[PDB]
């Protein structure tokens, strides 16, 4: 009786996801709060 | 001496920013020579409060700057500028887009 073995893309979506979605709100909010004009 | 400096507006309407038009001479600081607003509604510097005339053609997407009574020290690189006004109407900082400027010079 043979088992599955665990998703290689599972492992490194795991990693993958959440580092790319950090990033892009690093870049998001970096390039959007500091737009304005100052006096 | 009389002129007409003309600066037509691409890839954007500008129906509801300021169009402005400044002035910068060798060494000297960029400065506000005039706007205009959506409401027509037009702001001119001290220094040339009645020769320069701004206007606006909307459908055309441009701003217009008459110069009449050209004087030596009015010799510059003239800049177009379109922007929504924030703490300005007077100060470049407010102006988001920039023309490449227009030299310009009196000779007596």
């Known amino acids: 009786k043979t088992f599955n073995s665990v998703s290689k893309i599972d492992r490194l979506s795991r990693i993958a996801f959440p580092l790319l979605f950090g990033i892009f709100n690093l870049v998001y909010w970096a390039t959007y709060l500091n737009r304005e004009p100052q006096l | 001496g009389s002129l007409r400096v003309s600066c037509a507006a691409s890839?954007?309407?500008?129906?509801?920013?300021?169009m402005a038009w400044f002035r910068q001479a060798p060494g000297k600081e960029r400065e506000f020579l005039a706007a205009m607003d959506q409401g027509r509604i037009q702001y001119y510097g001290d220094s040339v409060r009645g020769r320069f005339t701004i206007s606006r053609d909307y459908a055309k997407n441009s701003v217009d700057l008459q110069l009449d009574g050209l004087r030596p020290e009015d010799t510059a690189v003239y800049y177009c500028?379109?922007?929504?006004?924030?703490?300005?109407?007077?100060?470049?900082?407010?102006?988001?887009?920039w023309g490449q400027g227009t030299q310009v010079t009196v000779s007596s």
């Open positions: 500028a379109a922007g929504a006004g924030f703490w300005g109407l007077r100060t470049a900082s407010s102006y988001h887009y």
């Open positions: 890839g954007r309407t500008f129906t509801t920013y300021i």
